[PDB]
């Protein structure tokens, strides 16, 4: 047997959480779990620890699963302290601990979150490689651990086919928060369409007032608003326009009891691996204040086992503190004065986005064409990226199917149109003909390109 304790703090529904796990048949395994519920109006740190280790003597508890209605930036970091003091695993998703980066101990036994902040930057790169968006500016305050993060997303070079395009990182000291003599002297780089901004909600509430004071409003949007840092979509102040493009996994958790059952399966699978390879169960600690050394040395095989475990097609190999490779991620849509919701989908390499256009705070044309010799050449897409590098067009061919893969178009007239777009102002909606009857008039009507001309479809040809 092993001991798994669940703790919920804050108002929640322990019945759906109870019922979800007690139908999970963990037989066909060598070890079986042992659940223990503990509720919740008590909220001091000392009561929490002195409650956990208050229990921790009667039952053999191998660990604690805590909750999503707390603020874990504060108390929770000390878990790696107590974890290395107790050698017991602690997993989870939960609360204020949204992508916490710290210098936790080597002997701590705990993994948490989902993707890393650089894996998050990698999906942010896959986002900018969907619409070929290129960063003109980054602005980050002096956190204790920001500048290494940006200097790693900077050092993650991207090979050409693409603009690599940094032009400005900006570290500003927010101690001396003189928005007149510091944030004004550090601007003027905002004449550019893309600005990255990695901060917290409160200092964004300050700096969005400064950005409104200078005139960083119109321009439309200001670009990266990382959700996982300042995660409260309900009570965010909004002193700017829309915002919230970005990514967390924080779909309102359709999967939270499934996350609990998956984590229980992870722990039980690791213990099953120990029984298959060594078989011996390390006895859990039995005290906190008394004889606290408690069979002092323990096999470091569990830290190696916590990483080598995977659950069927779902859980990833759990190596970097709790920073996985391909957990499910979501994308959010875009206003804070009207609490807009999720608009994207991400799964394990792939991105699906159902807006297709950038809002801006009529020069949009549909354009219907035809494949021929070297005026409009149609070629297939790259098998690694989907998009097209030198061809720069969707050409959304119908089969109807305006979701058929956006075949690349090359040739002479496209090179003419790409100059005429910058000449006045344009926006494409490029697609191919379907009936294949370009330039034909039959009895009554026209077909092909002239057929989509006579049908008044907001066109060029």
């Amino acid at each position, epitope marked *: 047997s092993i001991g798994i304790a669940v703790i919920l703090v804050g108002t929640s529904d322990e019945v759906a959480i109870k019922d979800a796990h007690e*139908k999970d*048949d*963990f*037989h*066909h395994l060598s070890v*079986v*779990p*042992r659940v223990e519920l503990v509720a919740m109006n008590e909220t001091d740190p000392k009561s929490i620890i002195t409650r956990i280790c208050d229990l921790m003597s*009667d039952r053999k508890i191998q660990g604690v699963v805590f909750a999503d209605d707390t603020d874990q930036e504060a108390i929770a970091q000390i878990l790696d302290f107590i974890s290395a003091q107790t050698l017991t695993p602690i997993l989870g998703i939960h609360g204020g601990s949204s992508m916490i980066m710290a210098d936790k101990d080597e002997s701590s036994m705990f993994f948490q979150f989902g993707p890393s902040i650089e894996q998050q930057a990698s999906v942010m790169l896959n986002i900018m490689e969907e619409y070929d968006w290129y960063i003109f500016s980054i602005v980050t305050t002096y956190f204790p651990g920001y500048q290494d993060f940006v200097n790693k997303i900077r050092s993650t070079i991207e090979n050409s086919f693409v603009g690599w395009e940094l032009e400005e990182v900006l570290l500003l000291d927010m101690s001396l928060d003189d928005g007149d003599s510091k944030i004004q002297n550090q601007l003027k780089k905002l004449q550019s369409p893309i600005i990255l901004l990695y901060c917290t909600k409160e200092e964004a509430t300050y700096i969005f007032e400064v950005a409104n004071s200078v005139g960083l409003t119109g321009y439309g949007y200001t670009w990266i608003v990382p959700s996982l840092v300042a995660g409260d979509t309900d009570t965010v102040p909004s002193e700017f326009p829309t915002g919230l493009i970005s990514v967390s996994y924080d779909e309102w958790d359709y999967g939270l009891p499934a996350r609990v059952r998956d984590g229980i399966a992870i722990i039980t699978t690791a213990a099953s691996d120990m029984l298959s390879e060594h078989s011996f169960i390390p006895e859990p600690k039995s005290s906190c204040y008394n004889t606290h050394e408690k069979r002092i040395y323990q096999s470091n095989m569990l830290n190696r086992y916590l990483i080598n475990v995977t659950f069927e097609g779902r859980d990833l190999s759990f190596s970097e503190d709790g920073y996985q490779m391909h957990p499910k991620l979501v994308i959010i849509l875009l206003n804070k004065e009207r609490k807009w919701e999720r608009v994207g989908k991400w799964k394990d390499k792939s991105l699906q986005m159902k807006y297709y256009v950038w809002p801006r705070m009529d020069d949009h044309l549909s354009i219907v064409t035809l494949e021929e010799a070297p005026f409009v050449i149609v070629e297939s897409v790259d098998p690694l990226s989907g998009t097209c590098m030198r061809n720069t067009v969707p050409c959304q061919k119908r089969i109807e199917e305006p979701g058929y893969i956006k075949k690349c178009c090359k040739g002479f007239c496209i090179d003419i149109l790409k100059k005429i777009s910058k000449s006045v102002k344009f926006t494409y909606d490029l697609y191919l003909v379907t009936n294949g009857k370009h330039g034909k008039k039959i009895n009554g009507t026209w077909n092909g390109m002239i057929g989509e001309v006579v049908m008044k479809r907001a066109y060029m040809a």
Partner: antibody
Amino acid sequence: VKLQESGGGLVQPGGSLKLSCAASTFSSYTMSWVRQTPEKRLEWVAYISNGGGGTYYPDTVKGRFTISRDNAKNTLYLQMNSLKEDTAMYYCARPSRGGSSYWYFDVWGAGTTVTV
Amino acid sequence: DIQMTQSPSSLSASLGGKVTITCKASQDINKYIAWYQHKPGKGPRLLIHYTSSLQPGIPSRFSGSGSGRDYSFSISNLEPEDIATYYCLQYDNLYTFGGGTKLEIK
């Protein structure tokens, strides 16, 4: 929820009598049952989990006994072979706090006998 | 598997006496204790949890103390509707049982 036993007998000397205890939620609830000595000892008989797995016994009746359960009809199934020196009473007991683990029942059955 | 042995064989006491029966298992139980009482042919009645926690409906006539693997359970001030026989349970591994004793009144 209440527990009611059935299938009482030891009509063949050295035979096999599949006894049961029906219930009226028992699907997340394990099962283990009890015979009584002439010294009245509440000795254990068998072990199943709630999900049919975890098929075990104590050292008294090992080697002869075939064990299963069905959580749809809320019944246990085990054939008695080595009670042939006892005039035992058997009851069913459903341990509290559910799960594939075990806890302290007040949820016991009714109590029926097996006489040779 | 772990096996238990209760002791000894007798509950010879008068009306309102004092008796004590010992849980003795082969392995460490970490105060995994229960206590049951029944008439011949009636059925068990729960007494005792982890910290000798009595049951609602069970009077304060029953107390106990002990730890680790050895536990003592004392009955006093006994009214003869409790003509019974007392039994101890451990559940470190799945369930555990020993002999136990029966009650007679002199």
